[PDB]
Amino acid sequence: MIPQTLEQLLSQAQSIAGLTFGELADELHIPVPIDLKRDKGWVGMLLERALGATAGSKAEQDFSHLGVELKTLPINAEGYPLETTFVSLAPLVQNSGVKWENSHVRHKLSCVLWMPIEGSRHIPLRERHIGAPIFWKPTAEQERQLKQDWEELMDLIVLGKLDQITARIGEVMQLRPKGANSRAVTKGIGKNGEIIDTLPLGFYLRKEFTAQILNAFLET
DNA sequence: GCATGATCATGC
DNA sequence: GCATGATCATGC
Ligand SMILES: [Ca+2]
Ligand SMILES: [Ca+2]
Numbered sequence A: 001m002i003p004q005t006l007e008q009l010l011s012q013a014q015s016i017a018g019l020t021f022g023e024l025a026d027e028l029h030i031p032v033p034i035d036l037k038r039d040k041g042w043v044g045m046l047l048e049r050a051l052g053a054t055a056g057s058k059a060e061q062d063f064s065h066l067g068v069e070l071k072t073l074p075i076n077a078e079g080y081p082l083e084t085t086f087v088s089l090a091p092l093v094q095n096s097g098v099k100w101e102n103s104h105v106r107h108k109l110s111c112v113l114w115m116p117i118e119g120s121r122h123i124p125l126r127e128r129h130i131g132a133p134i135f136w137k138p139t140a141e142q143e144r145q146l147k148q149d150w151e152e153l154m155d156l157i158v159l160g161k162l163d164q165i166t167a168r169i170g171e172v173m174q175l176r177p178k179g180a181n182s183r184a185v186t187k188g189i190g191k192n193g194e195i196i197d198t199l200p201l202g203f204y205l206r207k208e209f210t211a212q213i214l215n216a217f218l219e220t
Numbered sequence B, C: 001g002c003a004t005g006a007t008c009a010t011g012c
Helices: A006-016 A023-028 A041-051 A106-109 A138-160 A207-218
Strands: A071-074 A085-091 A111-119 A134-135 A171-177 A185-188 A197-200 A201-205
Touching: A006 A041, A006 A111, A006 A134, A023 A041, A041 A207, A071 A207, A106 A138, A111 A207, A134 A197, A134 A207, A138 A171, A138 A185, A138 A201, A138 A207, A201 A207
Parallel strands: A071 A111
Antiparallel strands: A085 A201, A111 A134, A171 A201, A185 A197
């Protein structure tokens, strides 16, 4: 079930490319909800089971033996991303120590298997199709971009400007809330260096960044 | 129209 | 609350 090599994983992915969520779900005996409003990570999980990836909250890696991270990517009819891509929670405290090279973010984005999927809301969940696999590793430029944003956003977190951080900061990667809702709370750093309560934040890739990944693939 | 800010399920 | 998986939907 669990692929032993990259070749096997890419082969299994290519095998489910073109299937509908319904066909795949039924084949795996997984119940399909009416929509994603209250099952937001359903497609993600559907693919994990279909490709033999690590389920549950197992830390940072779907195919640890391969060093590959699996990520679904919703796209519209023109092949453009319908949503941003979550990368990982941001450490709002004790971030002291990590450099870009040894970041959770860089690690999770070092080798990604993107599985594009039909994401248009008007399409009945059961009828949406799974796209062809896209195996990606950031180019020099992409990492230069990712690194820049990471350092910028991290400095703010390390300097208590948590109250200045807005989803507008960052060219390709940004910080947006990540949790149950607006009342969720985590430990952070105050305007005066004191541990306070604040909203949990996570790193996300803007649609423009992932769209380029989709484009650089087509131009192949 | 769509990005920002909000929100939903689950296991421990 | 955190870490897994993300999409929703209101404000502009
Ligand atoms: Ca996983
Ligand atoms: Ca994953």
